[PDB]
Design a protein around this ligand. Sequence first.
Ligand SMILES: *[C@@H]1O[C@H](CO)[C@@H](O[C@@H]2O[C@H](CO)[C@@H](O[C@@H]3O[C@H](CO)[C@@H](O)[C@H](O)[C@@H]3O)[C@H](O)[C@H]2NC(C)=O)[C@H](O)[C@H]1NC(C)=O
Ligand SMILES: *[C@@H]1O[C@H](CO)[C@@H](O[C@@H]2O[C@H](CO)[C@@H](O)[C@H](O)[C@H]2NC(C)=O)[C@H](O)[C@H]1NC(C)=O
Ligand SMILES: *[C@@H]1O[C@H](CO)[C@@H](O[C@@H]2O[C@H](CO)[C@@H](O)[C@H](O)[C@H]2NC(C)=O)[C@H](O)[C@H]1NC(C)=O
Ligand SMILES: *[C@@H]1O[C@H](CO)[C@@H](O[C@@H]2O[C@H](CO)[C@@H](O)[C@H](O)[C@H]2NC(C)=O)[C@H](O)[C@H]1NC(C)=O
Ligand SMILES: *[C@@H]1O[C@H](CO)[C@@H](O)[C@H](O)[C@H]1NC(C)=O
Ligand SMILES: *[C@@H]1O[C@H](CO)[C@@H](O)[C@H](O)[C@H]1NC(C)=O
Lengths: 654, 492, 119
Amino acid sequence: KIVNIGAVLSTRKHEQMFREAVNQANKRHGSWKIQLNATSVTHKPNAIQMALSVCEDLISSQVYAILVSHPPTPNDHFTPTPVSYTAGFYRIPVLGLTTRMSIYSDKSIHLSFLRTVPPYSHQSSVWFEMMRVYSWNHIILLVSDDHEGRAAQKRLETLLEERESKAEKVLQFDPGTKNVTALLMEAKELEARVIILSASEDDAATVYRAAAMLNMTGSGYVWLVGEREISGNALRYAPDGILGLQLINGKNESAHISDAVGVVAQAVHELLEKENITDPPRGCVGNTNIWKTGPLFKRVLMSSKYADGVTGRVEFNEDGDRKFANYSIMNLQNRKLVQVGIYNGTHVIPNDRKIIWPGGETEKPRGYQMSTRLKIVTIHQEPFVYVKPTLSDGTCKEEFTVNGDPVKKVICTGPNDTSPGSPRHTVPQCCYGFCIDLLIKLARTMNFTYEVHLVADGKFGTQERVNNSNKKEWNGMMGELLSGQADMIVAPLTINNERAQYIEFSKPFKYQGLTILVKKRITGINDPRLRNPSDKFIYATVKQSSVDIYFRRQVELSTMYRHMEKHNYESAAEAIQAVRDNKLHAFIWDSAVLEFEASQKCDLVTTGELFFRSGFGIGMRKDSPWKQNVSLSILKSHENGFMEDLDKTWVRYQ
Amino acid sequence: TVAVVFSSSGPPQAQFRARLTPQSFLDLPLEIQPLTVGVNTTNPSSLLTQICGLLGAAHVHGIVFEDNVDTEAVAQILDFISSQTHVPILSISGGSAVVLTPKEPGSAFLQLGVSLEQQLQVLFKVLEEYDWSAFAVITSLHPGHALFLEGVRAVADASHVSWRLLDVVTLELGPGGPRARTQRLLRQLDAPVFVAYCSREEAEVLFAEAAQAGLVGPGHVWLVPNLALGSTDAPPATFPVGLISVVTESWRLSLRQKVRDGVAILALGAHSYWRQHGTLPAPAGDCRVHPGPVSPAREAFYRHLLNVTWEGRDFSFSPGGYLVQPTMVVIALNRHRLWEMVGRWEHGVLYMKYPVWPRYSVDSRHLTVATLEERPFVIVESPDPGTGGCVPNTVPCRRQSNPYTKLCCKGFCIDILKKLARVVKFSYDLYLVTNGKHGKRVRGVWNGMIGEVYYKRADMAIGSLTINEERSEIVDFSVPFVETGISVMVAR
Amino acid sequence: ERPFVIVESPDPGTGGCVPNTVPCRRQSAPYTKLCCKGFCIDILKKLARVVKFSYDLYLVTNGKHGKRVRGVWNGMIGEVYYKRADMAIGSLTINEERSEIVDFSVPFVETGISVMVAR
Ligand SMILES: *[C@@H]1O[C@H](CO)[C@@H](O[C@@H]2O[C@H](CO)[C@@H](O[C@@H]3O[C@H](CO)[C@@H](O)[C@H](O)[C@@H]3O)[C@H](O)[C@H]2NC(C)=O)[C@H](O)[C@H]1NC(C)=O
Ligand SMILES: *[C@@H]1O[C@H](CO)[C@@H](O[C@@H]2O[C@H](CO)[C@@H](O)[C@H](O)[C@H]2NC(C)=O)[C@H](O)[C@H]1NC(C)=O
Ligand SMILES: *[C@@H]1O[C@H](CO)[C@@H](O[C@@H]2O[C@H](CO)[C@@H](O)[C@H](O)[C@H]2NC(C)=O)[C@H](O)[C@H]1NC(C)=O
Ligand SMILES: *[C@@H]1O[C@H](CO)[C@@H](O[C@@H]2O[C@H](CO)[C@@H](O)[C@H](O)[C@H]2NC(C)=O)[C@H](O)[C@H]1NC(C)=O
Ligand SMILES: *[C@@H]1O[C@H](CO)[C@@H](O)[C@H](O)[C@H]1NC(C)=O
Ligand SMILES: *[C@@H]1O[C@H](CO)[C@@H](O)[C@H](O)[C@H]1NC(C)=O
């Protein structure tokens, strides 16, 4: 039972080296029960004749596993295609000594394949490890349009979704293009301060020179690239301080031979005993059939736990990855490279001396360039936000209060001067209230700069699957916050589960709930008049509100929505006049503002107690840098009786 | 110039007799130039040498391929050769009708088939038409298993429905010996709708194992993409009756049908670009010189082969090498063990030939339930405004005439039965009656729900039905749950 | 503490104690299991089903709620900040002095400073 294998190579000197290596590795066992062999050929330019030569190798010996390498020719992607396709028809295992392209990782197009060197996707994982070292959490992922680009983006997406913090505005550019300045200029606005790139070498030089023209290689920033972005001629356009990384002992592959035969040896003596092996597919013509045991041999070889090759302990993944290969981190230390870190799977050891960042500062630079002029959005609410027209002199009434202290007012732009019907009138109004004073305190504490402007929709905003069916984009104010129209939200805004996914909330500063309003009396939600709606009494709420979602997610209460959706004023405090008009009897709304209405006005009564608990709070975009501080500030105010004093001044004396 | 080739077939004289003379399909706006080649049992070397020698000798301007026992990797050889020699080839047949998502940056393969995404779209529309609303997925890690697991989520997650998915299960089997744990793993599951994905022999062993396990009853339905069950012209053994699979327009397909389609479409594409400032194309170089590194302006001619139309059937294509906006049908296996037409998707919404599933064939499920609409207890309502699947918190019901219009019923007994079925794990359908409201033993014959239960035309009765000695003689009863009586309504 | 948490000795007649209760060790060789049930205990139970994790309950020995003496932290906050424990549940209040050295989640029981007197 002479078990025979083969291996094709490139330089015809590594062929002699392979012959010597295989005959030396034959000395592992010589018990005469099992023997080994080898046959080697060299490459050729034409693909079709090369594949015919592979078929000649197939017929010339009942082969067991072919091995492939790369020649010094620069035709990268056209190198390993024919052998895999031809040998896949008989489930003949193939071993790629060195090929880093992404496409081969898919076991559905090259169903028989095994690799020892990891593809370009796996190095992305290393970045994540590095990303956790210095606490960077806002990224700018820059990638090309090639299949490797999609693979890298997908790998980084799943690895981020493991911890599931965020990605930040990935943008892809076409391959082999010039003047990429448009996308870079578009993405230069964002607050993130670290970029990641993985594309072609010429594309790397082009993006390097374009960023140099746009002045992005300067101080403070840092962006790191993959493996081939710091090779070839890309160094002729690269600035100092960009991180780089390569594999420990690649592109040699002679030592890699010393691994491959090894594992296949560790395979052969473990396979010939299963039950009924007895044959590989003999012939290369006419015999239209597959090997009866191909999948078995491939699966057994895949799970092989090899002991020690030249390149450490080598295993395989579910698809044939490198399984804990090594990586060396080099720095562009004044147009050179210095090995600063060793990545072996669990971390990167900073055993080196010093790392220089693109800015020249020798300390670890953080990203998240903090802005100074925010874009604050607000909404008209009776006891919290007061809006008035201005005196044509340039502002509105500057006068003392009951106590004599000046009530501070700002100037906010905003609406169209008429909510239901008007083209637009974007005019400045004078703008003062409780939340305005709280924002004044916050700005004084944290050195802010504010430009307040109202919403155009006039509504808070819920989920709405529009007639153009798609993902339900957020409505009005929340869409303005998410799209980038606004940057921070200060208003009497509820905190609910449906909003917690995309927004980060601060600690609540005023506890409040839901309560009924009538003009006398009434009861909570128990009466049959509400269990069974009556033609006399009318129950209406504010449309596009959190209460709409609350009544749109209750199983038993669904029918009340049937009433509520029938007629509900898509309106505001204007709908308050409904209770004055004796049309709408019951108005279900938030406790604080509706209770202030009872005290300020007359003949308006609130019945019973609350039936729901929530809270107001300042919200910001997902994982904004300010959160902690802002929250802390609010809590500190709550300690000093500031909130109680504001409560007194604004809604007590009434 | 157009050429045809086949890898294997039955009696081969018919193809040569019906394709050789250049009078076949002589209606397209081009004088087709046909020429024939052939090959015996296919091998990679034989295929490669034969076809590229034919290209280098006859210098034809396109080739169409016909296929065989449907090997697994022939398409790889095909598009490799197409990329190497740079000729736009076409194939319409069994095994070659598999899509390859990652294409090569220079190949022109252009198969005639649909991806798994649109197949899942059509299948889920089929399910929503019946509205079973509860499905689980069971997939064996066959080639390209991850794509199915991605597509099922990508399709089910975004729609104006609920889709309360049950769970996902992954199976591995070597059927001969290692299927021991698979038996228990397949025993453990519980779901009313099954969707499978595997190969034909793998399907046969999986269904045998399912029959051994016992999760095959008519109260469960199987769903399988077009990848399996390829041999439509031959109903295989050990297959359960009443499964659903989806295929493109192929009932009219045959050897002659494919021959008539291919050359006609290729010639019409060759002439369409000529219709406006064009010239007839020329073949590529050979399979030896390895020429053509750059892509010339003639590649737009290949791009000109995207938009096409003939015979009313839309052959609109996609940038990846497949067709988009297709016309296709949904099939099933009836009691005679032969594939029969069930429905189709003609560019609009689903059609139907059997408005109700006949669940054709003792410790079974899907028991028959007959009821009547009493004023407070069981309420019957007209369906949703336009959709057909009525408003949630309701159960579809069907009044029979023995126009089976679909109404939606909800009420007290409706929720009672829903909770009961959810707690005892049974399936049901709601059927009303026509002969009287309740029924009495007039002239010694029972009408109404009591009579329907007596004649074994309905296994259960629910709703407003009291208890007394007269009915208790022949029909069993359960513990009462609503204390009723007889009272007198008067004025105030 | 207050009925937010309840600690009891295991039922000696039946060996352990009744269900709807979580075993809890008052570690300060000193193992002697008691069983604990209450409000925050039910929150943690019900809570544990939904994220999905497995946990134990050991009571606090030194200090009640944690105050800084000579620059050290004890009690709940000490046991969490010295990495000896992950989370501190029960009756824990939120203020500025605490939240600068330990993370805090959303509130679910509102309270404050209140005054009680005779009738
Ligand atoms: C869809 O398939 C049709 C079927 O042949 C193809 O028609 C394309 O239609 C465009 C529309 O303008 C035409 O482009 C030509 O551009 C030249 C520019 O000077 C102009 O002089 C012509 O009058 C004509 O407008 C042309 O018929 C054809 N496109 C090309 C590039 O030849 C086409 O294959 C598909 N349509 C498209 C838009 O690709
Ligand atoms: C390729 O790798 C092999 C093995 O890692 C290298 O050969 C080793 O070279 C070192 C230094 O000269 C010796 O100490 C070892 O004894 C050698 N090992 C063997 C098995 O010969 C080889 O030099 C590498 N070649 C290149 C170009 O990097
Ligand atoms: C890979 O390298 C890392 C760092 O050089 C090694 O990490 C150490 O592993 C020990 C256990 O052997 C642990 O105490 C720590 O994780 C690390 N020790 C430290 C930081 O002092 C790791 O062992 C190496 N080998 C692998 C991951 O297989
Ligand atoms: C959050 O607040 C802290 C403390 O108020 C800020 O840290 C201070 O930053 C300034 C300028 O960068 C330094 O002069 C102080 O010494 C820092 N404080 C301490 C205690 O070291 C921090 O910058 C704030 N972060 C944000 C995002 O607002
Ligand atoms: C062993 O390899 C040599 C190499 O040329 C070949 O000639 C011979 O036929 C092979 N024998 C077997 C049994 O594989
Ligand atoms: C093209 O390059 C020029 C460089 O002078 C630049 O000004 C221009 O904005 C670029 N155009 C685009 C679309 O990027």
